[PDB]
Amino acid sequence: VKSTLAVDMGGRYTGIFSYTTDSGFPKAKEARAYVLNMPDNDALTYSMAARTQTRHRIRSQQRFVLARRLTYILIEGKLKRKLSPREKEAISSLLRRRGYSRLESELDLSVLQGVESGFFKCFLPNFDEDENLLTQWTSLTDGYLQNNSDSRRQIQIFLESSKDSKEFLTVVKSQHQDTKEYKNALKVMRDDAESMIEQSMFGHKHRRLYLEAIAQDIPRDSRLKPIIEAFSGVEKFHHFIGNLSNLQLRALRWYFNDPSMKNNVFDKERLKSVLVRAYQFFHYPKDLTQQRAEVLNAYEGATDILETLQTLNPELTIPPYEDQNNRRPPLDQTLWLSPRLLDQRYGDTWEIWVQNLLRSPLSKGIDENLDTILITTDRKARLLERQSGRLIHYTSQKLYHSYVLQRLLDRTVENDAYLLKTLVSSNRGNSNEIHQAQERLTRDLGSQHIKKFLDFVRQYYDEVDKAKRGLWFIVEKPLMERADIHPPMKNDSVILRLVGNILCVSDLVDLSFWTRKVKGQSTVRSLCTAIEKTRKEYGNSFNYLYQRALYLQSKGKKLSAEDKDFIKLQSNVLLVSDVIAEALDIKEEQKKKFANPFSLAQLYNIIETEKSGFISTTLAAVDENAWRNNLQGKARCVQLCADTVRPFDGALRNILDRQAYEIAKLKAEELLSTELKNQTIDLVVLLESNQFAFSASLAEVKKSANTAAIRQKVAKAQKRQQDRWLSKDERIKSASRGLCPYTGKNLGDKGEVDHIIPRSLSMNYMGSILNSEANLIYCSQEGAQLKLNGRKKLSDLADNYLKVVFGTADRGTICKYIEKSVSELTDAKIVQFELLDRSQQDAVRHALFLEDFSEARRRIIRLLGKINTARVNGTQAWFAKSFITKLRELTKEWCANNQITLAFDLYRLDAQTVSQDYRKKFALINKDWAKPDDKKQPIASHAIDAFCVFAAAKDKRNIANVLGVFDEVAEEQNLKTIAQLMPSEVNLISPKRKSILDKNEVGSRALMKEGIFAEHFLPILVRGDDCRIGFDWSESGSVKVKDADKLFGVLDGLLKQSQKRSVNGFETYTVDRIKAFELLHDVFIRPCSQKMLEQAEVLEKLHYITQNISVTSVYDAVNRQFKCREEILKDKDFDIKVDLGNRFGSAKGKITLPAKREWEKLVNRSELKNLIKDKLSDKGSEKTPDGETLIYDIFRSIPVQKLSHKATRRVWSLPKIPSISSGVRIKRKDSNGNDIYQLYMLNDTKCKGFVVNEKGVIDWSSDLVADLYKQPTLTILNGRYLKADQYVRMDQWYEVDCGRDDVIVKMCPGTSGRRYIEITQSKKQFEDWTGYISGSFWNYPVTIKLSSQQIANFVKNSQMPLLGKPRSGQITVITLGNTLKYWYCVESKNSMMNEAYQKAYLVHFNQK
RNA sequence: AGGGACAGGAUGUUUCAGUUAUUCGUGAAAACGAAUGAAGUCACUCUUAAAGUGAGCUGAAAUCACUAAAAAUUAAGAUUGAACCCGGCUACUGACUCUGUCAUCCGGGU
DNA sequence: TTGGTGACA
DNA sequence: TGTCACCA
Ligand SMILES: [Mg+2]
Ligand SMILES: [Mg+2]
Ligand SMILES: [Mg+2]
Ligand SMILES: [Mg+2]
């Protein structure tokens, strides 16, 4: 009947405490504890940044390919002959390295003319005393652009000497110049020369510079002369090439988006239509209107699109900035009472209700604006109906009735309503006023319709209660509906409807202050702009979030915002408001209630920022809300409900989706494990919590680059959060000034914190009366031994305590004083208990000791009790929606089969409340449930947090009634009861991405690592009978072959031949790369003859892999120190092992890669000869910081200046032999259609399992490649064909006999070279095998990393060769407890594990 | 500021090819320039003048596969998201033009 | 992190 | 066949 889920969201770790029970709170069993170890972005990718970067790399490559296709098509159409390879190469050279179109600016100057160089001398060394900075900067714009030594030195000194400003403070205080101008100059002046870095060295050039370069060097290219002659001029060909180079990927795509375009057909009309469509796509700047007109008149009016390209100027066709503002606009979240669902539920009856209620005089004036606001579509369903032109449900009359009905339902309790929300409530008591409401309702609406009307009204208010809680998705049968349509962006027509919400004006038709002026020219312009400048140019003081006033609503320090900013604002505020004071009066609300200097004013992001995106809701919703909140009319209805917007952080949405899926999956397994088969309504209530630690830990997982700064600011936020200590200024300070309030005295430094209204009496009240600050008290434990959970009156307090606190011991006098003092402070002031003065705060606290008939007693209790129902955050709302949807999806079959009904409810628990008020109590009771001070809470402590969330929700009244766990039992017995409920085991869930072996769209996974590896075959040198494999005849360059005849007999058909060119010279045989790769692919992809197998084997003997690595690799960037020759010239990077057997000529040895000579002459360069030492021990403490720049200067050189369109060189490299991992060759085609082979490395698993024969014998040696790699263009390096009639999967677990009964060992193949081992054993036995302590299992990490000594101890003490050792000591825990389950990947497989799993597999296989 | 998306830029890695220079100013050659579309330099092994090999340089091409005209394809998968194309202005949204066209929009499809 | 590959003995 | 290092 009752299913409960307590979840603590903490980012990486999400604790869970779940139970499904029939009678109240569960037994000791039926309760389960889980922690989700959510993998980081590397193990499970949530962010799309890498995917998007790969997509745009692909799109840039495709843009170039399609531009080259179109250029060849057009040049061959005009040429009327096929382009030769030389002409194609020249054209592609013209097309390569087209310039950029963004991130460039010329200059500006506003403040440099008004500063003195005599005071800038502290940062500028060479400018004279009386010089002006503007002229010097104008000279520098040319000096540094010419890379003049003096100008660059001056700017470098300007940047280097301005690191401190202590002297400049005295300078400005000695002459009293305006610091704002000099600060502006320094903040627009002290920028690094990006315009030089990414112009001269990095090769970034603007599109206009690219066009000028190609115009310069098209004549000089002799390959283009036939094409220039065909185009009848260099200028025309330049215009053609530049116009084609300006096309985006989408234009070329549109041209080539046709199956017949694979023939490269030149279509005149298609190209014209594409070019017209291409440049009509752009939103041009207002300045470029004439350029847009020129381009569109050229293309649209083109009688010959090729001649238009030849004549239209390329500089005009450079596309403007990508105005992607309309990409996926926001959807309005407003909830609307729907005539569609009202007609689905009921017939014409509901419109009859609306008409009957409209006939009543009390409905006078409710439909004033429905003649005008109904014209604007407000929902998605109405949009669909109007698009179809077949309005049925949303006919204007039905919509009028829906709006009127919603206004009647959303009527405020004071606005002449029928006391709805009271006739509906189950607590409706027989009263005269409820009659004076219901009789009016039945007089107006009628007598027959009233039952159905009130059922509808109850359903409506239940739905809006869910909606305002952020849980509108729980209803499962909505009667309102979301808008789901885009609102317009903030244009003037919309600001007309948004100005009134701030100025509190009843209505506004024209922007007369802007259209026609009132108080001269500056009625608004520059006058409110002074206020805007004050808002924006004070940096972090005024408009910045994380301010004290706005981040936590502490209202500044005390008042430090007023006397520093608003005193300056006051004059402008008066001047602006004098205009509206003539046209509007209000009850002083236009400037003292609605408009404020800060906080609720929000003028910064509504009125003072034009457009700036989309408005929140559609204009229909805005008009409805403005009418309901009638301002001058003192409101008429409650504002429209809205659904919770999805989280803006997409990676957060993915993380929450995965967490919700995992938790809903485990809850589905838990409910499906039950034997329920009746019509029972199973209510699933979820309890959730989180805090700033959630954001701090989700800065991780995402692995955000800002994680340093995010944690830097969240650490300050967390310090502020923890600063709320001593229960908000309590203990020995507030309630008592010392000693104890009940007898006691001589308290000392230690006491205890106790309540005034304990659990038993508090359970009769709602909300936070049980735990509020005004309820808690500090007392001696012996003093609190009496009246443990009973009412505490004034007389129970010690007389001396009242004499110290209030000055007299008379209870009557003190209660009269409390009644006097508490009445002076308003409700909203006493609720904010921290803002109170200590006398007032103690009066509020003591108000609880008064009897029930007291006014202060009842007022304080009915304030602190019904304080709030904590709304879920947007992130929490998203997680809740995802979990509820996925659980209700995964259990649909089970609920259908067993006729179960999953009712859902949800409540939030404050993280600070549970951690401070239940976690510490459970630390008292157990001492293993205490919160550590490790600066990061451990894994099982999140399951502890979830259990404490359940415990806290037990004491919340409404939750307890809806949870089935309501009881008035005292604290002691309750804490001794719920402590019995916490299980001794914690299951750890570590979500994983789908293995590429199991996912059908393998393209969603990165198949190959970026970076291509060079593939080489060792040359074969023959000089008579003397045959060597290698490069030279030196013993270090080649190895000898005992019998060359066998090697050549094998490789007859695969060797090229270089003849002697002399009589005593040798012959060089090189493997033909094309035939070698074809043969290796054939032996990988199909069964081949033994000749081909031998040929592939010998080819792989001759095969070696190299890859160029930058010459800067001789420098260690982290240590800022050069590496030694022992590290640079390590033999592992240069030696090739030759192991030709007796079958293949018996050549055995090692060959040094001849790139080692290049590396040697690199480390022996005269500039680097002394900076690089010879041995590791010789590399002492000396460090050189500018080594990388030195190497760049080594290899950078100036060219002959042949071509303006030449690529710059930035990386110089030499080959080395790298460490490889699952090499794969990819067969592709060059631009001429010739097959090219390039070697990559697999990014993921290579083998799908192991082959098992018809007798169940697992082949542990043969690698069974996955089927996605068995393509006609893919060749797995060293791969052989293998047929698997049946095979064992890598994820196939079987328990291993292992010859023991105290342990349970399971293993699976897991990985080709390493098995996975899962061990279930006692925690004490694990701590005996390993030198691992970690205290209790509640402090254990999910990822245990044994030290090398601990690894050796585990291996030795296990006495189990079939366990191996964990790889790098990493152990992943699956369950925590007295019995421990964990799994690990073995460091290396051994035959005992293989034999044991073979026996386990045979046990199942022979069973069949 | 977060996220997503568009537009890409530039350098890399690999494959292929060329290259290990030739003519003129002027011819002493001091003396290096120019041009040949660009590049044209070093190292080792060979033993006769040519070479083999490796590197550098220059140019282009390729730079996940199925897979190819375009698209999707480097996220996730229990589900989805995003992208792109086609049709439409009956209509939510954006741009503009003399306001009806075009879209990032809507509806479908992959 | 992890699936692979080399060298060593 | 295990062992130890290394790669992105
Ligand atoms: Mg892609
Ligand atoms: Mg390769
Ligand atoms: Mg390279
Ligand atoms: Mg279209």
3-state SS, one letter per residue, for A491-550: CHHHHHHHHHHHHCCCCCCCCHHHHCCCCCCCCCCCHHHHHHHHHHHCCCCCCCCCCHHH
What are the tokens at A87? 């002409």
- Single out the residue of A1290, A1263, A1298, A1268 nearest to residue A1279, CA to CA: A1263
Surface-to-core class of residue A70, CB atoms within 10 Å of its CB (0-12 exposed, 13-18 middle, 19+ buried) = buried
From the CA of A277, how far away is ligand 4's center (Å)? 10
Measure the CA–CA gap between A150 and A142, rounded to whole angstroms.
Answer: 12
- Shortest-distance nucleotide from A1276 CA to C1': C4
The sign of the CA dihedral A403, A409, A410, A416 is positive
Burial A600-614 (b: 16+ CB within 10 A, else e): eeebeebbbeeeeeb
Distance A1157 CA to ligand 2 centre (A): 22
Is A119:A172 a contact under the CB 8 Å cutoff?
Answer: yes
Residue A667: CB atoms within 10 Å? 26
Nearest nt to the A1230 alpha carbon by C1': B61
Residue A326 buriedness (CB in 10 A; 0-12 / 13-18 / 19+): exposed
| Ligand 4: centre distance to CA A264 (Å) | 23
CA distance A439 to A316: 77
Is A1127 near strand C, with its CB below 7 A from some atom of it? no
Whether the CB-CB separation of A645 and A874 falls below 8 Å is answered with yes
Query: Could you give the CA distance from residue A375 to residue A371 in angstroms, rounded to a whole number?
Result: 8
Nearest ligand atom owner, CA of A1108: 3
From residue A858, give the alpha-carbon distance in Å to each of A107, A222, A516, A561, A844.
Answer: 70, 99, 58, 37, 12
Strand B: positions under 7 A of a protein C-beta atom: 1-16, 34-40, 42-79, 81-86, 90-97, 101-107
CATH numeric code, A2-45+649-715+873-989:
3.30.420
Rounded to the nearest angstrom, the distance between the alpha carbon of A59 and the centre of ligand 1 is 8
Q: With a 7 Å cutoff on the CB, does A1315 touch strand C?
A: no
Integer Cα distance of A477 and A179 in angstroms: 64
| Closest residue by C-alpha to C1' distance, nucleotide C7 | A1132
Q: Which nucleotide is nearest to A1220 (CA to C1')?
A: C5
For residue A1196, the Cα-to-chain-centroid distance in whole angstroms is 41
Token pair belonging to A188: 């627009």
What 8-state DSSP symbol labels residue A741?
S
**Strand-pair partners of A754:** A777
Phi-psi region of A328 (alpha: psi -120 to 50; beta: other; left: phi over 0): left
Closest protein residue to B93 using CA and C1' atoms? A486
**Nearest nucleotide (CA of A1309 to C1'):** C3
H or E stretch at A1341: none
Residue type, A794: L
Whether any strand C atom is under 7 angstroms from the Cβ of A1011: the reply reads no
Asked if A994 CB < 7 A from strand C, the reply is no
User: How long is the CA A293 to C1' B98 vector, in angstroms?
Assistant: 13
According to DSSP, residue A283 is labeled: -
Name A178's Cβ contacts closer than 8 Å, sequence gap at least 6. Answer: none
| Segment holding A293, helix H or strand E | helix A289-300
The answer to whether A735 touches A802, Cβ cutoff 8 Å, is no
Residue nearest to nucleotide B11 (CA to C1'): A1210
Helices in A1031-1072 by DSSP H: which ranges?
Answer: 1044-1050
DSSP for A1007-1033 reads: -EEEEEEEEEE--EEEETTEEEEESSS
CA nearest to A1205, candidates A243, A211, A318: A211
Looking up tokens 């982290």, which residue turns up?
A1118
Scan residues 1237-1276 of chain A and list those with Cβ within 7 Å of strand C: 1244-1247, 1263
Q: For B73, which residue's CA is nearest its C1'?
A: A1003
8 Å CB contact between A1320 and A1339: no
In chain A, positions 300-359 with C-beta closer than 7 Å to nucleic chain C are: none
Ligand 2 centroid to residue A1277 C-alpha, Å: 12
List the single protein residue with the shortest CA to C1' distance from B71.
Answer: A257
Tokens 């189950």 found at:
A426
DSSP state of A1137: E
> Which ligand lies nearest to the CA atom of residue A281 in the structure?
4
Q: Determine the nucleotide nearest to A1342 by Cα–C1' distance.
A: C1
* Cβ A308 vs Cβ A234: under 8 Å: no
- Nearest CA among A1332, A1371, A1365 for reference residue A1351: A1365
Method: cryo-EM
Joined tokens for residue A1240: 């990559």
Ligand 2 center–CA A1105 separation, angstroms: 8
Ordered DSSP codes for A965-976: ------HHHHHH
- Which nucleotides of strand D come closer than 7 angstroms to any CB of the protein? 1-4, 6-8
Q: Residues before each break in chain A (C–N > 2.5 Å)?
A: none
Query: Where along chain A do its domains lie?
Result: 2-45+649-715+873-989, 112-201, 223-320, 335-482, 489-615, 747-864, 1002-1216, 1223-1276, 1291-1407
Identify the CA nearest to A1311 among candidates A1347, A1364, A1273, A1253. A1364
Pairing of strands A1008-1017, A1370-1376: unpaired
DSSP 3-state of A1240: strand
DSSP annotation of A807: S
Q: How far is the CA of A1238 from the centre of ligand 2 (A)?
A: 4
Amino acid identity of residue A1272, one-letter, is: P
Beta-carbon contacts of A1204 under 8 Å, excluding residues fewer than 6 positions away, are: A212, A213, A214, A216, A217
User: With contact defined as beta carbons under 8 Å apart, do A434 and A423 qualify?
Assistant: yes
**Helix or strand holding residue A16 (H, E):** strand A13-21
Q: Closest CA to B8 C1' — which residue?
A: A60
For A433, counting Cβ atoms within 10 Å of its Cβ (0-12 exposed, 13-18 middle, 19+ buried), the class is: exposed
Strand partners, A1239: A1013, A1225
Q: Nearest residue to nucleotide B53 when comparing alpha carbons to its C1'?
A: A1031
Identify the H or E element spanning A1276.
strand A1274-1276
Distance A57 CA to ligand 1 centre (A): 8
Residue with tokens 């799908």, as numbered in its chain: A1248
> Which tokens sit at A324?
């992607």
Distance CA A247, CA A67 (A): 8
> What's phi and psi for A705, nearest 5 deg?
-65, -25
Structure tokens at A186: 């320094």
Amino acid letter, residue A208? R
A1181 C-alpha to center of ligand 2: Å?
40
Question: In angstroms, how far is B39 C1' from A992 CA?
Answer: 52
| Residues A390, A384: Cα–Cα separation, whole Å | 9
Angle at the Cα of A889 (from A888 to A893), degrees rounded to 5? 100
Orientation of helix A692-699 relative to helix A707-722, angle to 10°: 160
* Nearest nucleotide relative to A282: CA against C1': B95
**A83/D3 CA-to-C1' distance in Å:** 59
Distance CA A892, CA A898 (A): 10
Contact residues for A1315 (Cβ-Cβ < 8 A; gap 6+): A1307, A1308, A1309, A1364, A1385, A1386, A1389, A1393, A1394, A1397
